[PDB]
Amino acid sequence: TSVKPIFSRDMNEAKRRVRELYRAWYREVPNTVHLFQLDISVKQGRDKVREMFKKNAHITDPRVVDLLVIKGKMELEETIKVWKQRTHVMRFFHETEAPRPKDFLSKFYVGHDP
Amino acid sequence: YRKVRFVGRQKEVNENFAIDLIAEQPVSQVGSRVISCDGGGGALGHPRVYINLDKETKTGTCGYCGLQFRQ
Amino acid sequence: TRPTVRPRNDVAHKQLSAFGEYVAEILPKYVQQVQVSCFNELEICIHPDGVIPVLTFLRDHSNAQFKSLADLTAVDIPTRQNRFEIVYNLLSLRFNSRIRVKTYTDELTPIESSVPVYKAANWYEREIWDMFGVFFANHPDLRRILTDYGFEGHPFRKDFPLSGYVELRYDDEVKRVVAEPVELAQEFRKFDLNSPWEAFPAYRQPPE
Amino acid sequence: ITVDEKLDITTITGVPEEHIKTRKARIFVPARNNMQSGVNNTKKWKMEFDTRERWENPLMGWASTADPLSNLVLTFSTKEDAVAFAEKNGWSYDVEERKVPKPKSKSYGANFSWNKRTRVSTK
Amino acid sequence: LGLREIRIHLCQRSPGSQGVRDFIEKRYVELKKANPDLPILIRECSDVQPKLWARYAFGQEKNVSLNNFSADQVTRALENVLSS
Amino acid sequence: SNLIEVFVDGQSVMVEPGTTVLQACEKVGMQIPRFCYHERLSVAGNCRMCLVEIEKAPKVVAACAMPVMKGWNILTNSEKTKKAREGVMEFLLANHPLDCPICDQGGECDLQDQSMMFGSDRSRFLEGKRAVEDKNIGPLVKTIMTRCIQCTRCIRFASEIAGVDDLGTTGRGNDMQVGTYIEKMFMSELSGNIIDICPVGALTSKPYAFTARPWETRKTESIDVMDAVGSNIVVSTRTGEVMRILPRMHEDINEEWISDKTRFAYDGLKRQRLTEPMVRNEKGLLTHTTWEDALSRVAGMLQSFQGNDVAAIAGGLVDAEALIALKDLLNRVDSDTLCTEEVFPTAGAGTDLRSNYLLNTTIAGVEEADVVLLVGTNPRFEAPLFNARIRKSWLHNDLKVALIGSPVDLTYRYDHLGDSPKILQDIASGSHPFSQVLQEAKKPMVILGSSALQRNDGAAILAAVSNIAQKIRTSSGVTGDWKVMNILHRIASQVAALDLGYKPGVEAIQKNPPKMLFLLGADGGCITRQDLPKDCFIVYQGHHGDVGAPIADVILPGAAYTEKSATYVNTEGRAQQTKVAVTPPGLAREDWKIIRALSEIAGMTLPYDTLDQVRNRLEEVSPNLVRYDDVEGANYFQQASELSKLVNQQLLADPLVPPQLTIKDFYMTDSISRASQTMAKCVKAVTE
Amino acid sequence: KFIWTNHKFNLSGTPQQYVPYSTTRKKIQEWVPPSTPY
Amino acid sequence: KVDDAKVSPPKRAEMKTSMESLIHHFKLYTEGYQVPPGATYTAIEAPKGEFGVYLVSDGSSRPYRCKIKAPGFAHLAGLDKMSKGHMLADVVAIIGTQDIVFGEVDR
Amino acid sequence: RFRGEHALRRYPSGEERCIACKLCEAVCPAQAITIEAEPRADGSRRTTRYDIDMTKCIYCGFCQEACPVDAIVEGPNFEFSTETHEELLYNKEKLLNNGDKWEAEIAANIQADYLYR
Ligand code: SF4
Ligand code: SF4
Ligand code: SF4
Ligand code: SF4
Ligand code: FES
Ligand SMILES: [Zn+2]
């Protein structure tokens, strides 16, 4: 790869950075839940935080994870301040959406194989 | 099935039809070979088109012109 | 040839053939292609190692002022093996001359930004991040301008379709204005317009 | 410099939602709308995705639809970078082959024979 | 049953399957002269590992995978599933 | 070697010594305008549009009909060539009326894509515009002979490939016309295929006539299945409705031509179609119901059935993905007894490397043949483009064709050699001459038709013809590899059906009284309730209701061929996959998914879900079906010709009469041909 | 010729509101079963 | 209009008489013009500023990228320098001097 | 030359001046036109569905300057403002009726302006 990285070098400046801001989210989930005046339980927020980090764990290449670091840090800029007026934080939860079937016999009665 | 959306809405519909209103025209005649059809007036209406009238005395309304043209 | 044909001139085609020639002569480190447009424009193709100093060379001189940064744009080109194309456009105040800087790059490879060199690139440089993901280097404040807060698309590239996925609606289920998958009332009927038979002789491709 | 040469097949994700594994692209050659005979619309590879359902919108009969992509064609240069774009973002695909016709042997003058069969009439 | 049918695969080139291409010259005219009931199948080209299939017993596959045999090794391997 | 460097605009290229200026300039990637020229036709020159100014000459020549001498400078763009391409295409744009609001070729006419690029700006005529009258020929060719710029292109086609000598030139000078002098109708095979050749919109389609303009369609390529040779089509949608087809111009088959039947058979496709599952109701009553009513109705009956009490037939037009889900269901229950509709005799081989079962010669190798002898079929009214390749290869060189049995009207000089089945036995001996020439040819070609092979003497003539066929192969054979013996078909889903391992010819169902049957035949009425036992249910699965849906227990809606990503087999073994353009109407579903959905409501469940996973199963049986568009070199019938000699069944005594009539058998053929009101509209115009 | 008597209005529901509708044809023409006897 | 009529449409009294008028009328609305390739750029005096258009041409009836520069990108990013050291009531009086119009900052 | 409400014209005694040549559709910037045509049994082609999305309609008026047989006309009457979204989608049998609430209003403005254009 004839290309210079962004921040990390190989996997060890990387994996300590994804652990790093996890604590910043972890003290943020109880902090905002009384701030944005919404009403769920706070443990659901801590489950959804680790939901997001664990899903993308299939990467074996640097500067992509580092690209997600810049994406992950920019999320906190609106978050610590008040730039998401009670909707964008609720946008994380697919709440009023009807459930996808995800089962073969269930797909077969409704839909032209979507 | 669709008949419920207009209940108390009276179904504003057209009255006249141009499906067949060509047929009440006094079908024209010349006794020549080829005629212009700048019908409706010049520089408006349908463009100029030339028709052969030799065969069951007619033209075929020129498509564009619409008026029944014959001899 | 006639009236209603643009009368070209040769004086500006001469000096812009003259001026830009000894630019590559005095920096044969970064310049890789120079070309003269047939209507008095100039391109200086630059590998982005010299993204800062060549601007810094055009930042000041006694024979080239060029201190009016007008236009930072961004053009994507798929099927190039390095997609994107950052293109500047700068103006000489004392000389009335236009010249552009074409610098290619790729997605993940960053670019040393022009933050100390120019301070008109404060909102222009962030825009390419929001629309493409081209992470410029060492900018003091990278943020989100001209897009909404929840997008993940960087829409101005070609794989992002015309509508998004995020057609928004309201319900009184509790209070919220909730997102939903996108649903249109009409296809946006896509036509087919490219007529055959090759109206242009001059730009004829190498026939392979 | 910090060059740090390394190797990985670049598969980028997170930018769409789920339609990586769902769909399959198609790379082919558009070949001569045969109402006419202009051959300018060769020489460029194109793409088109899966086609999904088109129902009736029960107020007019419009072709309203789901299937949010459904209209994305790009202009490729050749077969070489045809594959390299489908892998760089990484969803499934299938490739056609370019068809060029016979050269071919056509010669006037042999249409008037002494003993052959190649002989035209009624011209 | 056993059995229902068998499926011969080969390849027209990559000459490891030349024993099968010899086997048709050796035992296809006489191999099907005996047992005129069993519908054995021949298809065109696996092009790598020209397997030999057998399928029977409520639809259960049985694949002997010849790579590159001689003219008698293809003759003896066939009677293993044939007699049983 | 054997070339001249000609500097086309001052740039070298090496052509053959004796080609054309047009093919030279088209080789370097340029277009000179083309009116009186076609590659697939002969060459005339009476439009005079291609005019290039050759260097070192004051005159101007035309690039259609002249050879190329020692290397010129073909000066394409000059200050005189543009004084010619402007010149000629100012005259013919005067004596012409002001159409195209209403001219149905209004988005592709060659007076409309030449006239922006080439040619002048305004007009100076300024009155005139002669106007001739039109007529009618057949109920297919909408006919405005006014426009008719007399490029002599439809005229030569009567002397070309379609051998009907019908048209001519009537008149002199300004006043000449093109149509037939008398009011004789013109209709045969390929007769609707002129309206592509007419380069202006003077000729057009009659049913398509006033529908939609050609800048709104979405061109998606596909394949038609109404014949065994396949096709190369392109459909065009409007709002999810089928508008029309055109030939896709493949270079092996469907050169610029297409079947005249398949062109206007799309009308009945959207006419008489069953959309929804209809329940038994105990009498001849048959009413619709929930899709989850008739699934569990037959699901319990499957587990009750076991052994040879359940069977199936399939001989229509369905794909090669629903003919495996059927096969992996009825042989996972291990009760096969299954057959097709078509009658093909099997005595020694056919399923086992198949050795002759495809058309062995390629269509591209037909033109290299020298003496052709074929028996027992009508080549004109089945596989229509097959005779077109014979017609063209009869021309342009020597080609010898004889025929045995039932003289029908072929175009070229054939000859009735004789009419008895004993002719086939005596040609192994020396009698009824040509006698040696089949051996003394260099590329012989002996073709058998499936219509005479349908008879009861089919296994007899199978070894009788192959007797003298291998006799020529054991002679030399040609030089050479040159497979000689070959055979044809007329049902599309037969060769794809048999090479899965089916048995041909209705015999297994002809001997037992099975209880439940699956109909994929289906309109071919060789199986009724008369040969069946008593009122036990038989299930129909298909798309139309011509023959077999009234005589049924439970019908199933399904997509026809323009709705599913299908896979077919031609008469040589290629695989030309169709693709989805319009999604099917009603509650019908794709015809392989229903079997897996019927499998999951039954006991056994098939181990593949998506269409890729279907093709992984399709890999297992035969690997040539995923090999797209290739015919591998594999004959291997030295042994298989000997194995059929085990059977020595004798002939019959009957004149070899085909089912094909004069013309009328060509129209009402498959299922949609009966349902199409267009074919019914024209077939009453022939008997009148 | 083809012109109205006096005038009209662009009112919301008079009761009449013009209630715009679809003006096309059924395309697929679903199959009819045979009758009550076998 | 321009007379050569590969760009201008012909007159209404002309598109109803001759043959040459319709084919260079009916085709000129199905597709557009035929623009040669090669990049271009210009700007003029908008009454509040320059007006950059970097119109990338491809070679068909449909253009490629069309990036615009409007004023307000410069004229309002420099509100950071201009504002400070001053009141809050100053800030509304600043904005109506640059004459900033939104929808025009959509460049 | 003021723009406004859509309407359709016809010849002397009624003929449907429209010929359904689809050109107004291909230049509408909002694609507010949708036309399905069909050969009527007399033989000359006419329309079956004809739509103007008066919501989507951005009033570029190019339909008035694209019809060769001069069919569609931007009629100068700003009389509007119904109460539903479900009403302003104009079908055909509004437009011929709306083209026949008046014609002398329309027929005098074209006849005073057709010399310029
Ligand atoms: S149909 Fe018309 S265009 Fe075609 S060859 Fe005949 S005269 Fe020429
Ligand atoms: S066929 Fe050619 S000349 Fe005739 S109307 Fe169409 S474009 Fe015009
Ligand atoms: S205005 Fe022109 S394009 Fe529109 S419907 Fe009428 S004739 Fe057709
Ligand atoms: S009025 Fe405007 S929006 Fe409507 S069709 Fe005409 S140009 Fe298009
Ligand atoms: S192009 Fe046919 S003669 Fe010139
Ligand atoms: Zn007229």
Side-chain angles (χ1 to χ4, degrees), chain I residues 13 20 23 43 45 49 55 63 65 82 113:
Chain I
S13 297
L23 278 175
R45 65 185 189 93
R49 190 172 69 239
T55 70
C63 69
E65 297 178 357
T82 67
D113 296 334

Side-chain angles (χ1 to χ4, degrees), chain B residues 36-37 39 46-47 49 61-62 64-66:
Chain B
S36 299
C37 290
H46 76 280
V49 60
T61 70
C62 298
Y64 301 97
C65 181

Side-chain angles (χ1 to χ4, degrees), chain F residues 24 47 66 97 191 207 315 344 405 407 411 505 536 557 559 562 594 648 685:
Chain F
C47 77
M66 62 182 291
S191 294
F344 173 74
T411 64
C536 295
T562 69
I594 183 168
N648 53 3

Side-chain angles (χ1 to χ4, degrees), chain I residues 3 6 24-25 27-33 52-53 56-64 72 74:
Chain I
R3 285 177 177 173
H6 287 83
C24 81
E25 199 274 334
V27 303
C28 171
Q31 299 189 1
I33 303 300
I52 291 174
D53 294 336
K56 293 182 174 64
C57 176
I58 199 162
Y59 298 99
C60 290
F62 294 155
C63 69
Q64 188 176 0
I72 189 170
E74 300 294 330

Side-chain angles (χ1 to χ4, degrees), chain F residues 83-121 123-141:
Chain F
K83 307 296 177 68
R85 288 177 177 173
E86 190 273 336
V88 174
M89 201 182 71
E90 190 269 334
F91 288 165
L92 50 88
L93 295 172
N95 282 319
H96 186 78
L98 272 68
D99 288 335
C100 262
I102 67 170
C103 182
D104 294 331
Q105 293 188 358
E108 287 87 3
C109 178
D110 293 331
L111 290 177
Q112 182 179 355
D113 283 333
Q114 303 302 107
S115 181
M116 287 188 71
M117 295 182 183
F118 301 92
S120 68
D121 197 6
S123 177
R124 42 167 184 169
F125 183 77
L126 57 94
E127 74 275 15
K129 290 187 177 67
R130 63 175 179 87
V132 300
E133 73 273 15
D134 52 354
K135 54 186 173 292
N136 193 0
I137 302 300
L140 298 177
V141 181

